[PDB]
Amino acid sequence: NNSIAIPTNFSISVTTEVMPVSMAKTSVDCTMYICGDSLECSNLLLQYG
């Protein structure tokens, strides 16, 4: 109840922190993945248009 600790010297410390910000941007083509260069398959894809 009558004791206290007080510092007598200091130090300067440089730390690092790594933060993600953005990721890769992607695009997908409906044709050339579902029906690749097929006229019979692309004639049926319009019903899922």
Binding site: S42, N43, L46, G49
Partner: protein
Amino acid sequence: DVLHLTQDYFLPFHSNLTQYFSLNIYFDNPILKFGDGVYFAA
């Protein structure tokens, strides 16, 4: 009231048709080609 997309035979836009005349000063009607369809404008 629909924006439906077809896939059939059509005349392509900005295509080059042939011109056949019938002037007097001639009379030509050659055997033309009928493929999947013919556009005829006289």
